[PDB]
Symmetry: D2
Subunit: 457 residues, 4 copies
């Protein structure tokens, strides 16, 4: 069919629900392959849903149009129009082209829901009805905040809490397994496997609190600032009304931003939220790395842990288990670190009344949230829940090390203890063998005095 905009008319495939402007600009920006995320499209649709409800309640929009717009927005949110959003991330820096994409798709679909047709005859107008009371300039920042906040609360925090619960159950189960510490990669003072795991659990607790610290600023919505922040041409109740309705729809305490200029001229809440995300990435990197190192072998590595084997091995290559989950996590943590830089450059580069690096900022923040959430969940399900200690190997490393010699200090003094360690080292023997050789400690004394289970605090 032919759709129309202020430049004229243009053919749009009958099967598609977008209009003139989307079609026109689907030719101006063949840049790469990244498109707006479903999360972001859904957040935009939620704003359109909320605006229709509020505009109905205020008496400025007819009920039939309002209801059809709400129903169309709900279909988008339910995932039923996956193919109607074809535009690139690399577009207008305000996200205008994508705002128009929502307006046109919702107008065409709402028109069908009213018994009408797609295209120039439609009863619902993209700008005058779907976009009523809004500007591209205040809609897109609003959608960024909503998309990021909901992804954090509904996807990331629960995944982190699940992994935390698992590692804490493992910590409890491993509380009595004494192992050799490693500092600088070198044999060190003992601790329990449970204590080491309790570190990971605490890192997750800290990360969860840091991420939560990003929410209050994200909850502040630009909607109602209109073109430049002043609220010119907005209905006086729209800002508060839309924010309350978004709150009702999401279950989260969204509020109208106390300073519209700040949340339009800048995307600082996304910069800060991403700072929290890269803190989680640093923790997950460490956790994932420790686990793959501790499970390395089966015979020329550390060998302290066994992990589940996800993908089929060789039969000739037992018990070679590649730590695929740790590799996926460590890779995505690198991606989060890169994404932070892209967000930072964009966030820093606002000019005057509007930051126009927005589609890129949103693309990165939402990707980072998905990566960390799915990564934590997958690592939980396919690795962490099945971690097992190799108890004999752990205990052999512990007792064949040189590190337990400090237990002898009270009983024979530092110098003789040091003398035994040096001799075991030089000769390739156990501490016990060297201690017996020097005549400094009987077999029975060694066993009574050298108790790893008493050396862990």
């Amino acid at each position: 069919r032919m759709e129309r905009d202020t430049f004229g008319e243009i053919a749009v495939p009958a099967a598609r629900l977008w209009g003139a402007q989307t079609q026109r600009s689907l030719q101006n920006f063949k840049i790469s392959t990244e498109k707006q995320s479903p999360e972001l499209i859904h957040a935009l649709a939620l704003i359109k849903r909320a605006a229709a409800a509020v505009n109905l309640e205020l008496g400025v929009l007819a009920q039939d149009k309002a209801n059809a717009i709400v129903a169309a927005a709900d279909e988008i949110i339910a995932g039923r129009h996956a193919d109607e959003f074809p535009l690139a991330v690399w577009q207008t820096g305000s996200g205008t082209q994508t705002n128009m994409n929502l307006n046109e798709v919702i107008a065409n679909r709402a028109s069908e829901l009213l018994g009408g047709e797609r295209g120039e005859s439609r009863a619902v107008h993209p700008n005058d009805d779907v976009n009523r009371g809004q500007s591209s300039n205040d809609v897109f920042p609003t959608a960024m905040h909503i998309a990021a906040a909901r992804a954090i609360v509904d996807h990331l925090l629960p995944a982190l809490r699940t992994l935390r619960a698992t590692l804490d159950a493992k910590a409890a189960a491993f509380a009595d397994i004494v192992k050799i510490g490693r500092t600088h990669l070198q044999d060190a003072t003992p601790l329990t496997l449970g204590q080491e795991f309790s570190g990971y659990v605490a890192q997750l607790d800290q990360g969860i609190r840091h991420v939560e610290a990003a929410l209050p600023h994200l909850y502040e919505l630009a909607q109602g600032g209109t073109a430049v922040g002043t609220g010119l041409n907005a209905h006086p109740k729209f800002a508060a009304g839309v924010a309350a309705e978004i709150g009702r729809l999401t279950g989260l305490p969204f509020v109208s931003a106390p300073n519209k200029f700040e949340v339009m001229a800048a995307a600082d809440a996304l910069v800060f939220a991403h700072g929290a995300l890269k803190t989680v990435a640093a923790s997950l990197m460490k956790i994932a790395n420790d686990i793959r190192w501790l499970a390395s072998g089966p015979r020329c590595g550390l060998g302290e842990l066994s992990i589940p084997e996800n993908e089929p091995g060789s039969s000739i290559m037992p018990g070679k288990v590649n730590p695929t989950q740790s590799e996926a996590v460590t890779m995505l943590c690198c991606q989060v670190f890169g994404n932070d830089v892209a967000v930072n450059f964009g966030g820093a580069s606002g000019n005057f009344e509007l930051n126009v690096f927005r589609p890129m900022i949103a693309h990165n923040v939402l990707q980072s949230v998905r990566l960390l959430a799915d990564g934590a969940q997958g690592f939980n399900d396919h690795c962490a829940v099945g971690i097992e200690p190799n108890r004999a190997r752990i205990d052999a490393l512990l007792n064949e090390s040189l590190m337990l010699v400090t237990a002898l200090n009270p009983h024979i003094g530092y110098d003789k203890a040091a003398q035994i360690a040096k001799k075991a080292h030089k000769e390739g023997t156990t501490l016990k063998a060297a201690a017996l050789a020097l005549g400094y400690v009987t077999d029975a004394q060694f066993d009574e005095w050298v108790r790893p289970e008493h050396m862990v605090g």
Copy 2:
């Protein structure tokens, strides 16, 4: 149908061409939505094509299988199997799961081409035939290098050369337009609009040479290193043969890497290539920014340039032209900067015989190439070719500035010249008006002595 691997059997949709391992691991890594790029899948298929040809020539693979494998690989390369590669970037760090995806799809399709069926009855074996003489460990590094090099030569360099040609044609056309320089954002010494544009052209020339400097290392292929770099179990002629065949297929001087350990244990060629890409990003950022600033207005900005209007305006809002191409470019340049960090962290994090951050490294490098290439092309087509000078505005800024006062220095000395500038500034007048007021310069003298066209070198 039921397909089988060493863990057992698993259902695969009849409509799909992949096998047991792809299907199995399409459930282990539901991480986010990023999949391997077509560029990378094509480079992998090219290796399989080359291996089949070489293995035929060496006499180790039957002609019928070889021909069917080549034909299947060609179909993948022609874009006919877009839906047969469903795996995430966030997978095995070696890219093994994706190597298996190629082997299985090509085996199933080659089997059809031989008159056979998909699945367990197939005549072509994914590992024993499609993967003959190869390891996942040496295939994936090879494909990274090929994908990056071809994308650079076939996509990025031509786009950069096109933009360079356009800006140089503009430089020539604007060679006699004298304008006010700006340093620190402040009014400064004059230059021509052509000279300013010649800067952009030179930045593109420099960038093209820097990017070309990344090619020789990318041309070095790991193929033939097998599991750990030694070439154990490779046919002795395979490494050289495959590299020559990849050379023939691509038209580029690919060679067998002189040190297999280096191109397997590290992805340093990709790290370096991405260093070149972020240099281009810094240049494009500057170019894109200057152009949008110089075109800012229509009345409260700089106003020196007009740019084409891509997307329909308002009718009420002439001549407001949002610089959409500059916004797309500046955003993607931010993305390239982030991508560099992700590449760097991954590149730095190899252990012993294999770097296993590879799918992430490849994802970023290939994205950056696409962004810069399509970005440069779009900026060319939709902005640069239609840049026009606002000649009256440029000349008004020039002659109403305070900067031309230095022309008077030889004729009345520094102090009187400085005296005129200070008076024009204080009084809000032209230099000429102040010069006449002080009685230091006649009207006729001003016009004879103050010649911007002689102040540009």
Copy 3:
């Protein structure tokens, strides 16, 4: 003099207060020129001061030694031993060499304070007295947290609050100055200069709250974890005692870390704090940029603001004022963004019981704090306090723009309003001139209907 360690003896200049190990390792790490910051050295000295007091109170350290150690630590904190800390940042990753530097300097100086001598005869032992109850492994993380927290509270937050107060006083003063908005760099809807400034103020408020959100984790101290986190060989009251004493000394609510493993195996609090710092950097970049752009000229820029001239101009080059403070700030904001990446790579790279990227992490975090604090203060003092509006220029841009045409919409309808704007644009005239020409609006009507002061909400 000759000082001694377990490798033997080594000459130390008589004029210096350090000992064998510092001297020895002042030759092993001639890497570049960066040394530990005074902030970090002071935080280390504070720990030694606190340990001495606590160890005295517990009865394990003699009063004379305790008092001399406290007095020596105080001298370091007062800045009296600036030349006694010669080691590089690029040292042991645990900061051990620097811990030893504190122990040796304090031992030698305390020995002098007791009537003794520097060197091998000293009454105070670096390890057995100054380092009593401590490990390098738990001291350095403790000092990182203290140094970062105090620098945030005592240096950065007050500087940010001072700049915020100034910009808010400016906002109030400029509340009635109506100006042209700019979105995408293009002329847009009006707002007041005060409203625009209120955006900056709100960004600072947000940043201050985000930075404060980093403090609780920084307040958690590793001290008492000893070698690997377990607290082996620590006096049972030392951890709580030292944290309380650091609290008393600083006025801040430092506490013993609930999980020692987490704050030793990782530096995640510093990663998060730096995430807050780079959020402030993104805001300051925007603020500093807007101000220099708005002050650009004097005649070929935007020209809306005048800023103080710090450094002497030319006399021939009035009124060229280079925005030096904005340049310093924008440059240091770039540095903060880089520093974040270095912190992130280090933070992510802990192994097992100890993260050994610590001197580098600390160097970056503390540099970023200093840069942002001194930058905000300097920008306040030398730029922000003296910002003045160029009222005639602002009002001329406003009224000579095309943007005020929307005021006519209610009185003559959109189409005629749009018609006037298009004609002014095409002809190079004011809106009023075009409106009179078309006979759509009288002079008196224009003035009554087009009221910028009513178009700002």
Copy 4:
């Protein structure tokens, strides 16, 4: 004494050689503690030396002044005026304040060398003589290029070549030591220790070539572009003359930049050079990491290598050797990655005729060069030259692994080989023990058939 500038007079300590402007602006920029590097100050002095010589040769500068300026510049270059350059990096973005610092110090010192005095009576004028024919705008870019190029050629490349030679001598010495490979951290196919080391050597060769690829653009000098690139007010022979003289002084092929606008409006050569530097950082990270991992223990790590012990150990803690050199290198590699981001943001942020992020860009590039050069040298001297293989441990890991089972494939087939590996794994025995138990291979057959020395290509 009192010195004077266009704002008036100001006290300068009699002991210091700088003048009014340096003193004045030593109060405007108390930002943090970073000052211009000696490398950069020396490069600036070299330009002043070259300008004096050229200006003498052209007849525009008196011989006595020229000679005194040259002599003063030489003293600065010889390191004799370390305390005369007190300004911060965080200054004018053009580096003007630092250009003035050189002009004033050289003028005052040259005046002394002519029999005159420091201060207002001086015979040599900072601007009119020391800065003759130059602008701050073209001097600073010139000095950045010189400083970076010389640091690369004279400091970094030789250090990299020294480390490369050492690791290649080690590779040769270890060519017959067969060891277990590791991929994904897991036991893998064998290779020689020499082959593994040859990887590191090849990474260094590649890095050296990549760094060399940055030199031609760095050799292009802005000097002669004057204020905005046009060369207005430059002597027509100055650009070529100064570049030739800098070439003569340094031994390097410096040339006048073919496009002055490009090397003034942008610092793209520094962006690219830093891209090369971060490639070297990725390689050094890997090398340094592998070595510390391979030397980890003495008993609960990998244990394949011994490294020199730099700093004194414990006596009680043999043979615990912390890998301090690897820690210093890995930390500084993180710093280089961060520095790249700061350089990139600055490089991307030029406006119109001048990039004014220059002191920050230079600070980072020159720091990265020093870190990598001193890091490589220190790692060479204090680690690499003394690396020794633990031959018994290497051979025990090899022969007690499961990996050698593939040697049996030709002699008993895959299935029986796989059967032996599975049994050794399950039972905790050697492959030989399991092979004998199953009756599949005699003792004599095992030794004849399983030859690690034939499994390395």
